[PDB]
């Protein structure tokens, strides 16, 4: 709560996880199983970084382990997805899962029911591009998702208020008028409703794959999925 806006931004920028590579193997064609394998193997490795990133989000480590578990269980796929959409901004029509795994919508058809989710992710990437979403805004949004998504399941709300001040500060510093500031704040936060929707559909899809024995999921993923 002590942190200034500039300190908050620096903290969040510093905590950013790396972009990981997939285990993509260009020697063989994709199958439904092999693509699901790549994507879930990637998610799994990302998760370990996500856990350590969360610990660096102001206020998170003050919570009980149970509360930390609950927030990450609620938000993990939302966080993976907003990360994906951010990575994919400078690649119209494609999703940059990894630098060696850049897929267009046609490749999503490889997995039953996946292309619908690709389409939503692509539309969100387009919206980010239309808004000219900045990196400093992105990290604020990602932290908001972590702290908000499972919060209704005061300390947390104070941090959330601090991130709001931070978003407004960034916008003011960028020269937006006062009216433009609350309008953009709203536009950015309404994106979070769409990210929630995609996460819910993505979770249903993943559950479907598991229940059809399409891909072996790690114990961690099984449990993250089971929390839903």
């Amino acid at each position: 709560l002590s942190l200034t806006a500039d300190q908050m931004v620096s903290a969040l920028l510093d905590a950013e996880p790396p972009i990981l590579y997939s285990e993509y193997d260009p020697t063989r064609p994709f199958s439904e199983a092999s693509m699901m394998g790549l994507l879930t193997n990637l998610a799994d490795r990302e998760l370990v970084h996500m856990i350590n990133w969360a610990k660096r989000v102001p206020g998170f480590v003050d919570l009980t382990l149970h509360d930390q578990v609950h927030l990450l269980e609620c938000a993990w796929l939302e966080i993976l997805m907003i990360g994906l959409v951010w990575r994919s901004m400078e690649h119209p029509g494609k999703l940059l899962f990894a630098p060696n795994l850049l897929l267009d919508r046609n490749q999503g058809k490889c997995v039953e029911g996946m292309v619908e989710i690709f389409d939503m992710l692509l539309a969100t990437s387009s919206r980010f591009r239309m808004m000219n979403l900045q990196g400093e805004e992105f990290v604020c949004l990602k932290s908001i998702i972590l702290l908000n998504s499972g919060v209704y399941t005061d300390h947390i709300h104070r941090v959330l208020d601090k991130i709001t001040d931070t978003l407004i500060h960034l916008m003011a510093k960028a020269g937006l008028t006062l009216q433009q500031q609350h309008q953009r704040l709203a536009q950015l936060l309404l994106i979070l409703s769409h990210i929630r929707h995609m996460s819910n559909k993505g979770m249903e899809h993943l559950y479907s794959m598991k229940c059809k024995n399409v891909v072996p999921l790690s114990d961690l993923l099984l449990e993250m999925l089971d929390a839903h």
């Binding site: 350590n52 382990l65 149970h66 269980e73 114990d219 961690l220 449990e223």
Partner: peptide, 11 residues
Amino acid sequence: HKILHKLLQDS
């Protein structure tokens, strides 16, 4: 306890 519960500690 959940595996996440463990990872939140180790490290």
